[PDB]
Structure 1
Amino acid sequence: NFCVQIIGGFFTWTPDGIPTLSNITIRIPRGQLTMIVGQVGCGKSSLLLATLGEMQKVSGAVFWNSNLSRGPVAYASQKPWLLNATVEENITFESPFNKQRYKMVIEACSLQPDIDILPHGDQTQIGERGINLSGGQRQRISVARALYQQTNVVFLDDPFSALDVHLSDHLMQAGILELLRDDKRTVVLVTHKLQYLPHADWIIAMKDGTIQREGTLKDFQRSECQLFEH
Protein backbone atom coordinates (compact mmCIF):
# COMPACT_ATOMS: atom_id res chain seq x y z
CA ASN A 1 0.00 0.00 0.00
CA PHE A 2 1.14 3.54 0.75
CA CYS A 3 4.74 3.71 1.94
CA VAL A 4 3.88 6.42 4.50
CA GLN A 5 0.26 5.89 5.57
CA ILE A 6 -1.02 6.93 9.00
CA ILE A 7 -4.53 6.28 10.34
CA GLY A 8 -4.53 7.37 13.98
CA GLY A 9 -1.09 8.87 14.54
CA PHE A 10 -1.53 9.24 18.31
CA PHE A 11 2.16 8.75 19.03
CA THR A 12 3.52 9.53 22.48
CA TRP A 13 6.87 9.33 24.27
CA THR A 14 5.43 8.68 27.73
CA PRO A 15 4.67 4.94 28.09
CA ASP A 16 1.19 5.69 29.49
CA GLY A 17 -0.85 8.53 28.02
CA ILE A 18 0.18 12.13 27.33
CA PRO A 19 -0.03 12.05 23.50
CA THR A 20 2.38 14.63 22.09
CA LEU A 21 0.66 14.28 18.70
CA SER A 22 -2.61 12.82 17.43
CA ASN A 23 -5.13 12.84 14.58
CA ILE A 24 -2.47 12.28 11.92
CA THR A 25 -3.91 11.21 8.55
CA ILE A 26 -1.55 10.91 5.57
CA ARG A 27 -1.15 8.44 2.70
CA ILE A 28 2.08 8.53 0.67
CA PRO A 29 2.24 5.77 -1.99
CA ARG A 30 5.37 4.50 -3.70
CA GLY A 31 7.44 6.83 -5.86
CA GLN A 32 6.23 9.96 -4.06
CA LEU A 33 8.91 12.51 -3.13
CA THR A 34 7.14 14.15 -0.18
CA MET A 35 9.39 16.59 1.67
CA ILE A 36 8.19 17.74 5.09
CA VAL A 37 8.08 21.46 5.91
CA GLY A 38 6.75 23.55 8.76
CA GLN A 39 7.49 26.21 11.33
CA VAL A 40 10.17 26.00 14.04
CA GLY A 41 9.62 23.28 16.62
CA CYS A 42 6.25 22.15 15.26
CA GLY A 43 6.79 18.48 16.10
CA LYS A 44 8.66 17.81 12.86
CA SER A 45 11.12 15.47 14.59
CA SER A 46 8.38 13.78 16.61
CA LEU A 47 6.32 13.13 13.47
CA LEU A 48 9.41 11.74 11.72
CA LEU A 49 10.20 9.43 14.64
CA ALA A 50 6.56 8.34 14.79
CA THR A 51 6.74 7.53 11.08
CA LEU A 52 9.79 5.33 11.70
CA GLY A 53 8.12 3.74 14.72
CA GLU A 54 10.19 5.09 17.61
CA MET A 55 7.18 6.68 19.35
CA GLN A 56 4.46 4.86 21.29
CA LYS A 57 1.20 5.22 19.39
CA VAL A 58 -2.08 5.37 21.32
CA SER A 59 -4.93 5.33 18.79
CA GLY A 60 -3.57 2.28 16.99
CA ALA A 61 -1.17 0.93 14.42
CA VAL A 62 -0.78 3.09 11.31
CA PHE A 63 -0.58 -0.13 9.23
CA TRP A 64 2.23 -0.92 6.79
CA ASN A 65 2.89 -3.04 3.72
CA SER A 66 5.88 -4.07 1.64
CA ASN A 67 7.04 -1.29 -0.68
CA LEU A 68 7.52 -3.61 -3.67
CA SER A 69 4.67 -6.61 6.71
CA ARG A 70 7.36 -3.92 6.86
CA GLY A 71 9.21 -1.68 9.30
CA PRO A 72 12.80 -1.47 8.03
CA VAL A 73 12.86 2.10 6.70
CA ALA A 74 15.84 4.41 6.21
CA TYR A 75 15.95 7.30 8.66
CA ALA A 76 18.55 9.78 9.90
CA SER A 77 16.72 12.22 12.21
CA GLN A 78 18.52 15.28 13.57
CA LYS A 79 22.23 15.70 14.43
CA PRO A 80 25.08 13.91 12.60
CA TRP A 81 25.71 10.33 13.74
CA LEU A 82 29.35 9.72 12.81
CA LEU A 83 31.12 6.37 13.00
CA ASN A 84 34.46 6.82 14.77
CA ALA A 85 36.38 5.22 11.90
CA THR A 86 37.66 6.11 8.43
CA VAL A 87 35.53 8.51 6.39
CA GLU A 88 35.32 6.12 3.44
CA GLU A 89 33.97 3.31 5.63
CA ASN A 90 31.53 5.81 7.14
CA ILE A 91 30.15 6.62 3.68
CA THR A 92 29.69 2.97 2.69
CA PHE A 93 28.09 1.90 6.00
CA GLU A 94 27.97 -1.85 5.37
CA SER A 95 27.19 -1.47 1.66
CA PRO A 96 28.94 -2.79 -1.47
CA PHE A 97 31.67 -0.51 -2.82
CA ASN A 98 31.29 0.66 -6.42
CA LYS A 99 33.83 3.14 -7.79
CA GLN A 100 31.28 4.78 -10.09
CA ARG A 101 28.64 4.91 -7.35
CA TYR A 102 31.16 6.23 -4.80
CA LYS A 103 32.39 8.86 -7.25
CA MET A 104 28.81 9.83 -8.09
CA VAL A 105 27.94 10.30 -4.41
CA ILE A 106 31.13 12.19 -3.55
CA GLU A 107 30.41 14.47 -6.52
CA ALA A 108 26.87 15.12 -5.28
CA CYS A 109 28.14 15.49 -1.71
CA SER A 110 31.04 17.67 -2.97
CA LEU A 111 33.32 15.94 -0.45
CA GLN A 112 36.38 16.18 -2.73
CA PRO A 113 37.76 19.30 -0.95
CA ASP A 114 37.22 17.63 2.43
CA ILE A 115 39.23 14.54 1.49
CA ASP A 116 42.00 16.50 -0.24
CA ILE A 117 42.39 18.94 2.67
CA LEU A 118 42.89 16.13 5.18
CA PRO A 119 46.48 14.78 5.03
CA HIS A 120 45.19 11.20 5.42
CA GLY A 121 42.27 11.75 3.04
CA ASP A 122 39.08 9.83 3.77
CA GLN A 123 40.98 7.45 6.08
CA THR A 124 40.91 9.90 9.00
CA GLN A 125 39.10 8.88 12.16
CA ILE A 126 35.98 11.00 11.63
CA GLY A 127 34.01 11.73 14.78
CA GLU A 128 34.98 11.23 18.41
CA ARG A 129 38.49 10.06 19.35
CA GLY A 130 39.87 11.43 16.09
CA ILE A 131 39.91 14.47 13.81
CA ASN A 132 37.30 17.11 14.64
CA LEU A 133 35.63 18.69 11.60
CA SER A 134 32.95 21.30 10.97
CA GLY A 135 29.32 20.68 11.84
CA GLY A 136 28.23 21.28 8.25
CA GLN A 137 30.82 18.82 6.95
CA ARG A 138 29.55 16.26 9.48
CA GLN A 139 26.01 16.66 8.13
CA ARG A 140 27.19 16.26 4.53
CA ILE A 141 28.82 12.93 5.39
CA SER A 142 25.75 11.87 7.38
CA VAL A 143 23.18 12.64 4.68
CA ALA A 144 25.36 11.09 1.96
CA ARG A 145 25.63 7.91 4.05
CA ALA A 146 21.87 7.33 3.84
CA LEU A 147 21.72 8.22 0.14
CA TYR A 148 24.56 5.84 -0.79
CA GLN A 149 22.59 2.94 0.71
CA GLN A 150 20.33 2.93 -2.39
CA THR A 151 17.06 2.15 -0.62
CA ASN A 152 13.47 2.50 -1.81
CA VAL A 153 12.67 4.95 1.02
CA VAL A 154 14.90 7.76 2.33
CA PHE A 155 14.17 9.96 5.35
CA LEU A 156 16.26 13.09 5.90
CA ASP A 157 16.19 15.93 8.44
CA ASP A 158 17.68 19.38 7.81
CA PRO A 159 20.01 18.52 4.90
CA PHE A 160 20.60 22.15 3.89
CA SER A 161 19.80 23.75 7.26
CA ALA A 162 23.08 22.55 8.79
CA LEU A 163 25.12 24.03 5.93
CA ASP A 164 23.53 26.58 3.58
CA VAL A 165 26.43 26.75 1.12
CA HIS A 166 24.98 27.20 -2.36
CA LEU A 167 27.71 25.22 -4.12
CA SER A 168 27.34 22.16 -1.89
CA ASP A 169 23.54 22.21 -1.61
CA HIS A 170 22.76 22.77 -5.30
CA LEU A 171 24.87 19.82 -6.46
CA MET A 172 23.41 17.70 -3.66
CA GLN A 173 19.93 18.90 -4.63
CA ALA A 174 20.63 18.06 -8.27
CA GLY A 175 22.06 14.69 -7.27
CA ILE A 176 19.14 13.89 -4.97
CA LEU A 177 16.44 14.60 -7.55
CA GLU A 178 18.24 12.77 -10.36
CA LEU A 179 19.03 9.73 -8.21
CA LEU A 180 15.46 9.50 -6.91
CA ARG A 181 14.03 9.90 -10.42
CA ASP A 182 16.20 7.10 -11.83
CA ASP A 183 15.48 4.77 -8.90
CA LYS A 184 11.78 5.75 -8.67
CA ARG A 185 12.13 5.62 -4.89
CA THR A 186 10.40 7.50 -2.06
CA VAL A 187 12.11 10.52 -0.48
CA VAL A 188 10.98 12.51 2.56
CA LEU A 189 13.02 15.53 3.69
CA VAL A 190 12.48 17.77 6.72
CA THR A 191 14.12 21.15 6.20
CA HIS A 192 13.60 24.91 6.34
CA LYS A 193 15.34 25.55 3.01
CA LEU A 194 13.20 27.71 0.71
CA GLN A 195 15.42 27.09 -2.33
CA TYR A 196 13.37 24.00 -3.26
CA LEU A 197 10.40 24.47 -0.92
CA PRO A 198 7.92 24.55 -3.85
CA HIS A 199 8.08 21.62 -6.25
CA ALA A 200 5.84 19.60 -8.53
CA ASP A 201 6.31 16.68 -6.14
CA TRP A 202 4.15 16.18 -3.06
CA ILE A 203 4.69 18.48 -0.08
CA ILE A 204 3.43 18.01 3.49
CA ALA A 205 3.13 20.83 6.03
CA MET A 206 3.55 20.05 9.73
CA LYS A 207 2.41 22.42 12.47
CA ASP A 208 1.17 22.02 16.06
CA GLY A 209 1.82 18.28 15.95
CA THR A 210 -0.41 17.62 12.94
CA ILE A 211 -0.25 17.68 9.14
CA GLN A 212 -2.80 19.65 7.13
CA ARG A 213 -2.24 17.75 3.87
CA GLU A 214 0.40 15.86 1.87
CA GLY A 215 -0.37 16.63 -1.76
CA THR A 216 0.51 18.79 -4.74
CA LEU A 217 2.01 22.28 -4.54
CA LYS A 218 -1.34 23.70 -5.70
CA ASP A 219 -2.53 23.30 -2.10
CA PHE A 220 -0.24 26.22 -1.21
CA GLN A 221 -2.29 28.40 -3.55
CA ARG A 222 -5.42 26.72 -2.16
CA SER A 223 -4.22 27.51 1.37
CA GLU A 224 -5.09 30.97 2.66
CA CYS A 225 -1.42 31.80 3.34
CA GLN A 226 1.03 31.23 0.47
CA LEU A 227 3.97 30.67 2.83
CA PHE A 228 3.85 34.40 3.69
CA GLU A 229 4.54 35.15 0.00
CA HIS A 230 7.71 33.05 0.22
Structure 2
Amino acid sequence: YALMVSNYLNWMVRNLADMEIQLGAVKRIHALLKTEAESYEGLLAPSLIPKNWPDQGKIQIQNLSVRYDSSLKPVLKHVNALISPGQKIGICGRTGSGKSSFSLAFFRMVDMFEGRIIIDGIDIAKLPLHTLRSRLSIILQDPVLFSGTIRFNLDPEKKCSDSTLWEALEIAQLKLVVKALPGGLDAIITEGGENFSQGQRQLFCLARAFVRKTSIFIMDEATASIDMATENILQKVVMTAFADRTVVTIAHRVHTILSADLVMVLKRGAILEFDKPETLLSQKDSVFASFVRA
Protein backbone atom coordinates (compact mmCIF):
# COMPACT_ATOMS: atom_id res chain seq x y z
CA TYR A 1 0.00 0.00 0.00
CA ALA A 2 2.96 2.40 0.45
CA LEU A 3 3.81 2.00 -3.24
CA MET A 4 0.17 2.92 -3.91
CA VAL A 5 0.71 6.11 -1.91
CA SER A 6 3.74 6.86 -4.11
CA ASN A 7 1.68 6.29 -7.25
CA TYR A 8 -1.66 7.79 -6.18
CA LEU A 9 -0.87 10.87 -4.06
CA ASN A 10 0.08 12.69 -7.27
CA TRP A 11 -2.94 11.27 -9.11
CA MET A 12 -5.28 12.39 -6.30
CA VAL A 13 -3.86 15.93 -6.32
CA ARG A 14 -4.01 16.03 -10.15
CA ASN A 15 -7.63 14.82 -10.17
CA LEU A 16 -8.53 17.38 -7.48
CA ALA A 17 -7.11 20.23 -9.60
CA ASP A 18 -8.89 18.78 -12.65
CA MET A 19 -12.18 18.52 -10.70
CA GLU A 20 -11.86 22.17 -9.66
CA ILE A 21 -11.44 23.10 -13.34
CA GLN A 22 -14.49 20.97 -14.29
CA LEU A 23 -16.60 22.56 -11.54
CA GLY A 24 -15.60 25.88 -13.11
CA ALA A 25 -17.46 24.83 -16.28
CA VAL A 26 -20.47 23.74 -14.21
CA LYS A 27 -20.25 27.12 -12.43
CA ARG A 28 -20.30 29.05 -15.72
CA ILE A 29 -23.32 27.03 -16.90
CA HIS A 30 -25.16 27.75 -13.63
CA ALA A 31 -24.30 31.47 -13.84
CA LEU A 32 -25.87 31.49 -17.30
CA LEU A 33 -28.72 29.38 -15.86
CA LYS A 34 -29.77 32.08 -13.37
CA THR A 35 -30.47 34.70 -16.07
CA GLU A 36 -33.89 36.36 -15.92
CA ALA A 37 -36.67 35.35 -18.30
CA GLU A 38 -39.43 37.33 -19.98
CA SER A 39 -42.92 37.04 -18.50
CA TYR A 40 -44.69 34.79 -21.02
CA GLU A 41 -47.68 34.12 -18.75
CA GLY A 42 -49.81 37.20 -19.40
CA LEU A 43 -52.44 38.62 -17.05
CA LEU A 44 -55.41 38.20 -19.40
CA ALA A 45 -57.18 34.84 -19.45
CA PRO A 46 -56.71 32.70 -22.59
CA SER A 47 -60.49 32.34 -22.93
CA LEU A 48 -60.85 36.13 -23.02
CA ILE A 49 -58.55 36.21 -26.07
CA PRO A 50 -60.59 35.43 -29.22
CA LYS A 51 -59.44 32.99 -31.88
CA ASN A 52 -58.48 35.96 -34.08
CA TRP A 53 -57.84 38.75 -31.57
CA PRO A 54 -56.59 41.00 -34.41
CA ASP A 55 -60.08 40.74 -35.88
CA GLN A 56 -59.71 43.89 -38.01
CA GLY A 57 -56.37 45.51 -37.13
CA LYS A 58 -57.28 48.60 -35.09
CA ILE A 59 -54.34 50.04 -33.15
CA GLN A 60 -54.67 52.57 -30.33
CA ILE A 61 -51.56 54.05 -28.74
CA GLN A 62 -52.24 55.96 -25.52
CA ASN A 63 -49.42 58.01 -23.93
CA LEU A 64 -46.81 55.43 -24.92
CA SER A 65 -43.26 56.06 -23.72
CA VAL A 66 -40.78 53.22 -24.18
CA ARG A 67 -37.20 52.61 -23.11
CA TYR A 68 -34.81 49.66 -23.36
CA ASP A 69 -33.79 49.28 -19.70
CA SER A 70 -34.33 50.82 -16.29
CA SER A 71 -32.34 54.03 -15.62
CA LEU A 72 -32.10 54.62 -19.39
CA LYS A 73 -33.36 57.49 -21.53
CA PRO A 74 -36.85 56.90 -23.03
CA VAL A 75 -36.39 56.50 -26.78
CA LEU A 76 -40.07 57.40 -27.30
CA LYS A 77 -41.67 60.24 -25.32
CA HIS A 78 -45.47 60.50 -24.93
CA VAL A 79 -46.40 58.76 -28.18
CA ASN A 80 -50.16 59.00 -28.77
CA ALA A 81 -51.83 57.92 -32.01
CA LEU A 82 -54.80 56.09 -33.50
CA ILE A 83 -54.73 53.68 -36.45
CA SER A 84 -58.09 52.72 -37.92
CA PRO A 85 -58.22 49.15 -39.32
CA GLY A 86 -57.16 48.84 -42.94
CA GLN A 87 -55.18 52.10 -42.82
CA LYS A 88 -51.64 52.41 -44.14
CA ILE A 89 -49.30 54.34 -41.83
CA GLY A 90 -45.98 55.58 -43.16
CA ILE A 91 -43.37 56.43 -40.53
CA CYS A 92 -40.52 58.79 -41.34
CA GLY A 93 -37.71 60.55 -39.52
CA ARG A 94 -33.97 60.82 -39.19
CA THR A 95 -31.83 57.95 -37.93
CA GLY A 96 -32.03 57.75 -34.15
CA SER A 97 -35.57 59.14 -33.81
CA GLY A 98 -37.00 56.03 -32.15
CA LYS A 99 -38.94 54.71 -35.14
CA SER A 100 -37.61 51.13 -34.97
CA SER A 101 -38.34 51.03 -31.23
CA PHE A 102 -41.87 52.07 -32.25
CA SER A 103 -42.07 48.88 -34.33
CA LEU A 104 -40.63 46.83 -31.46
CA ALA A 105 -43.20 48.32 -29.05
CA PHE A 106 -46.01 46.26 -30.61
CA PHE A 107 -44.13 43.02 -29.87
CA ARG A 108 -43.18 44.07 -26.29
CA MET A 109 -39.46 43.97 -27.14
CA VAL A 110 -38.96 47.31 -25.34
CA ASP A 111 -39.72 48.38 -21.78
CA MET A 112 -43.08 50.17 -21.96
CA PHE A 113 -42.70 51.83 -18.57
CA GLU A 114 -45.77 53.99 -19.23
CA GLY A 115 -48.54 54.04 -21.80
CA ARG A 116 -50.68 51.40 -23.47
CA ILE A 117 -50.96 49.80 -26.90
CA ILE A 118 -54.57 48.64 -27.22
CA ILE A 119 -55.16 46.45 -30.27
CA ASP A 120 -58.84 45.65 -31.04
CA GLY A 121 -59.92 46.50 -27.50
CA ILE A 122 -57.21 44.37 -25.84
CA ASP A 123 -54.14 45.78 -24.11
CA ILE A 124 -51.11 43.83 -25.34
CA ALA A 125 -49.39 44.01 -21.94
CA LYS A 126 -52.12 41.67 -20.63
CA LEU A 127 -51.38 39.06 -23.31
CA PRO A 128 -48.82 36.25 -23.46
CA LEU A 129 -45.76 36.99 -25.57
CA HIS A 130 -46.25 34.01 -27.89
CA THR A 131 -49.91 34.98 -28.28
CA LEU A 132 -48.92 38.58 -29.09
CA ARG A 133 -45.97 37.79 -31.38
CA SER A 134 -47.69 34.97 -33.29
CA ARG A 135 -50.59 37.06 -34.65
CA LEU A 136 -48.40 39.95 -35.86
CA SER A 137 -45.77 39.99 -38.61
CA ILE A 138 -42.67 42.19 -38.73
CA ILE A 139 -39.99 42.63 -41.41
CA LEU A 140 -36.71 43.86 -39.97
CA GLN A 141 -34.31 45.99 -42.01
CA ASP A 142 -31.47 43.48 -41.58
CA PRO A 143 -32.26 40.02 -43.02
CA VAL A 144 -31.81 36.93 -40.85
CA LEU A 145 -31.69 33.62 -42.74
CA PHE A 146 -31.11 30.10 -41.43
CA SER A 147 -29.48 27.03 -42.93
CA GLY A 148 -31.97 24.78 -44.68
CA THR A 149 -34.40 24.84 -47.56
CA ILE A 150 -36.39 27.82 -48.81
CA ARG A 151 -39.50 26.02 -47.52
CA PHE A 152 -37.91 25.75 -44.06
CA ASN A 153 -37.04 29.46 -44.01
CA LEU A 154 -40.52 30.57 -45.12
CA ASP A 155 -42.43 27.88 -43.18
CA PRO A 156 -40.39 26.20 -40.42
CA GLU A 157 -43.44 24.71 -38.67
CA LYS A 158 -44.76 23.34 -42.03
CA LYS A 159 -48.18 24.92 -41.45
CA CYS A 160 -48.70 26.23 -45.01
CA SER A 161 -48.97 24.57 -48.40
CA ASP A 162 -46.78 25.11 -51.46
CA SER A 163 -49.27 27.50 -53.11
CA THR A 164 -49.07 29.85 -50.11
CA LEU A 165 -45.26 29.75 -50.26
CA TRP A 166 -45.32 30.49 -54.00
CA GLU A 167 -47.71 33.42 -53.46
CA ALA A 168 -45.35 34.76 -50.77
CA LEU A 169 -42.38 34.40 -53.14
CA GLU A 170 -44.29 35.97 -56.05
CA ILE A 171 -45.25 39.03 -53.99
CA ALA A 172 -41.62 39.35 -52.82
CA GLN A 173 -40.41 39.18 -56.49
CA LEU A 174 -38.77 35.78 -55.98
CA LYS A 175 -40.95 33.55 -58.18
CA LEU A 176 -38.51 33.54 -61.11
CA VAL A 177 -35.40 33.37 -58.88
CA VAL A 178 -36.59 30.39 -56.81
CA LYS A 179 -38.05 28.69 -59.90
CA ALA A 180 -34.67 29.07 -61.64
CA LEU A 181 -32.99 27.15 -58.80
CA PRO A 182 -32.99 23.39 -59.51
CA GLY A 183 -34.42 22.32 -56.15
CA GLY A 184 -37.30 24.79 -56.30
CA LEU A 185 -38.71 25.25 -52.80
CA ASP A 186 -36.15 22.64 -51.67
CA ALA A 187 -33.21 24.82 -52.78
CA ILE A 188 -30.71 25.07 -49.94
CA ILE A 189 -30.15 28.41 -48.21
CA THR A 190 -26.69 28.43 -46.63
CA GLU A 191 -25.78 29.75 -43.17
CA GLY A 192 -26.73 33.42 -43.24
CA GLY A 193 -27.97 33.14 -46.84
CA GLU A 194 -24.50 33.51 -48.36
CA ASN A 195 -25.57 31.89 -51.65
CA PHE A 196 -27.99 34.80 -52.23
CA SER A 197 -27.53 38.54 -52.55
CA GLN A 198 -28.37 41.05 -49.81
CA GLY A 199 -31.50 42.11 -51.67
CA GLN A 200 -32.48 38.49 -52.31
CA ARG A 201 -31.94 37.61 -48.63
CA GLN A 202 -34.14 40.56 -47.65
CA LEU A 203 -36.78 39.49 -50.19
CA PHE A 204 -36.65 36.01 -48.64
CA CYS A 205 -37.40 37.60 -45.27
CA LEU A 206 -40.26 39.60 -46.82
CA ALA A 207 -41.67 36.36 -48.27
CA ARG A 208 -41.11 34.81 -44.82
CA ALA A 209 -43.50 37.39 -43.40
CA PHE A 210 -45.96 37.02 -46.29
CA VAL A 211 -46.56 33.34 -45.39
CA ARG A 212 -48.04 34.19 -41.97
CA LYS A 213 -51.02 36.17 -43.39
CA THR A 214 -51.84 38.17 -40.27
CA SER A 215 -54.01 41.27 -39.82
CA ILE A 216 -51.25 43.76 -38.87
CA PHE A 217 -48.00 44.02 -40.84
CA ILE A 218 -45.13 46.18 -39.56
CA MET A 219 -42.52 46.69 -42.30
CA ASP A 220 -39.51 48.23 -40.52
CA GLU A 221 -37.38 49.66 -43.38
CA ALA A 222 -37.76 46.43 -45.34
CA THR A 223 -36.82 47.79 -48.78
CA ALA A 224 -33.52 49.42 -47.74
CA SER A 225 -31.36 46.83 -49.55
CA ILE A 226 -33.65 46.74 -52.61
CA ASP A 227 -33.27 48.76 -55.81
CA MET A 228 -35.92 51.40 -56.52
CA ALA A 229 -37.33 49.69 -59.64
CA THR A 230 -38.25 46.45 -57.90
CA GLU A 231 -39.10 48.31 -54.66
CA ASN A 232 -41.89 50.20 -56.43
CA ILE A 233 -43.51 47.07 -57.89
CA LEU A 234 -43.02 45.24 -54.55
CA GLN A 235 -44.72 48.14 -52.73
CA LYS A 236 -47.58 48.12 -55.25
CA VAL A 237 -48.14 44.36 -54.99
CA VAL A 238 -47.93 44.52 -51.16
CA MET A 239 -50.54 47.31 -51.16
CA THR A 240 -52.86 45.34 -53.45
CA ALA A 241 -52.39 41.98 -51.70
CA PHE A 242 -52.79 43.46 -48.20
CA ALA A 243 -55.54 45.97 -48.98
CA ASP A 244 -57.71 44.93 -46.01
CA ARG A 245 -54.75 44.66 -43.61
CA THR A 246 -53.31 47.41 -41.42
CA VAL A 247 -49.73 48.04 -42.56
CA VAL A 248 -47.32 50.20 -40.55
CA THR A 249 -44.59 50.95 -43.11
CA ILE A 250 -41.37 52.52 -41.84
CA ALA A 251 -39.91 54.29 -44.86
CA HIS A 252 -36.24 54.09 -45.73
CA ARG A 253 -37.23 56.25 -48.72
CA VAL A 254 -39.85 58.91 -47.98
CA HIS A 255 -41.32 58.88 -51.52
CA THR A 256 -42.56 55.32 -50.87
CA ILE A 257 -45.06 56.58 -48.25
CA LEU A 258 -46.52 59.39 -50.37
CA SER A 259 -49.49 57.09 -51.10
CA ALA A 260 -50.02 56.15 -47.44
CA ASP A 261 -53.24 56.99 -45.60
CA LEU A 262 -51.45 58.64 -42.67
CA VAL A 263 -47.85 59.73 -42.12
CA MET A 264 -46.23 59.75 -38.67
CA VAL A 265 -43.20 62.07 -38.59
CA LEU A 266 -40.97 61.28 -35.62
CA LYS A 267 -38.58 63.92 -34.27
CA ARG A 268 -36.28 62.69 -31.46
CA GLY A 269 -38.83 60.20 -30.16
CA ALA A 270 -41.87 62.50 -30.36
CA ILE A 271 -44.61 62.47 -32.99
CA LEU A 272 -44.27 65.95 -34.46
CA GLU A 273 -46.74 65.36 -37.32
CA PHE A 274 -49.44 62.69 -37.73
CA ASP A 275 -51.81 63.49 -40.60
CA LYS A 276 -52.64 62.63 -44.21
CA PRO A 277 -49.77 63.32 -46.66
CA GLU A 278 -52.01 65.45 -48.89
CA THR A 279 -52.62 67.93 -46.07
CA LEU A 280 -49.08 67.49 -44.70
CA LEU A 281 -47.44 68.41 -48.02
CA SER A 282 -49.75 71.43 -48.32
CA GLN A 283 -47.99 73.07 -45.36
CA LYS A 284 -44.76 74.70 -46.51
CA ASP A 285 -43.11 74.61 -43.07
CA SER A 286 -43.88 70.93 -42.40
CA VAL A 287 -40.90 68.63 -41.85
CA PHE A 288 -42.45 65.89 -44.04
CA ALA A 289 -42.40 68.36 -46.94
CA SER A 290 -38.68 68.86 -46.25
CA PHE A 291 -38.26 65.07 -46.40
CA VAL A 292 -40.03 64.89 -49.77
CA ARG A 293 -38.35 67.98 -51.28
CA ALA A 294 -34.82 67.04 -50.18
The CA distance in 1 between the partners of 2:183 and 2:89, in whole Å, is 39
> Where does residue 155 of structure 1 map in the other structure?
218
The letter for the 1-side match of 2:151 is E
Task: For residue 171 of structure 1, give the secondary structure of its aligned residue in structure 2.
Answer: helix
Higher share in helix: 2
Q: Which deviates the most, 196-205 or 142-151?
A: 196-205
Q: Give the one of 214, 223, 227 matched to 1:164.
A: 227
Aligned residues: 225
The CA distance in 2 between the partners of 1:196 and 1:83, in whole Å, is 29
The letter for the 2-side match of 1:13 is Y
1:221 equivalent to 2:276? Answer no
Q: Render the CA deviation track for 1:7-65: whole Å, top value 9, x for unaligned.
A: 2222111224432321111111211111212223322212221233211122x241424
Query: Identity percentage over the alignment?
Result: 24
Structure 1 residues 171 and 88, CA gap change in structure 2 (3 angstroms): farther
Q: Render the CA deviation track for 1:82-127: whole Å, top value 9, x for unaligned.
A: 232211232234442152x433332222213422443433323324
Larger Rg: 2
Structure 1 residues 192 and 142, CA gap change in structure 2 (3 angstroms): same
> Where does residue 38 of structure 1 map in the other structure?
93
1:49 equivalent to 2:98? Answer no
Structure 1 residues 129 and 174, CA gap change in structure 2 (3 angstroms): closer
1:209 equivalent to 2:269? Answer yes
The CA distance in 2 between the partners of 1:109 and 1:40, in whole Å, is 26
Structure 1 residues 223 and 88, CA gap change in structure 2 (3 angstroms): farther
Q: Is the 8 Å Cα contact of residues 84 and 128 (structure 1) preserved in structure 2?
A: yes
Q: Render the CA deviation track for 1:107-165: whole Å, top value 9, x for unaligned.
A: 22221342244343332332417753211111001012112211100011222211124
Q: Is the 8 Å Cα contact of residues 74 and 151 (structure 1) preserved in structure 2?
A: yes
The CA distance in 2 between the partners of 1:177 and 1:14, in whole Å, is 36
1:132 equivalent to 2:206? Answer no
1:96 equivalent to 2:133? Answer no
1:11 equivalent to 2:66? Answer yes
Shift of 1:77: 2.8
The letter for the 2-side match of 1:220 is L
Task: For residue 203 of structure 1, give the secondary structure of its aligned residue in structure 2.
Answer: strand
Q: Give the one of 143, 148, 166 matched to 1:80.
A: 143
Structure 1 residues 152 and 163, CA gap change in structure 2 (3 angstroms): same
Q: Is the 8 Å Cα contact of residues 193 and 201 (structure 2) preserved in structure 1?
A: no
Name structure 1 gaps, 5 residues minimum. none
TM-score of the two chains, using structure 2 as the length reference: 0.67
Structure 1 residues 127 and 56, CA gap change in structure 2 (3 angstroms): farther
Name structure 2 gaps, 5 residues minimum. 1-55, 125-131
Structure 1 residues 153 and 93, CA gap change in structure 2 (3 angstroms): farther
Q: Give the one of 139, 143, 146 matched to 2:209.
A: 146
The CA distance in 1 between the partners of 2:165 and 2:57, in whole Å, is 31
Q: Is the 8 Å Cα contact of residues 141 and 222 (structure 2) preserved in structure 1?
A: no
Structure possessing the higher relative contact order (Cα contacts under 8 Å, 6 or more residues apart): 1
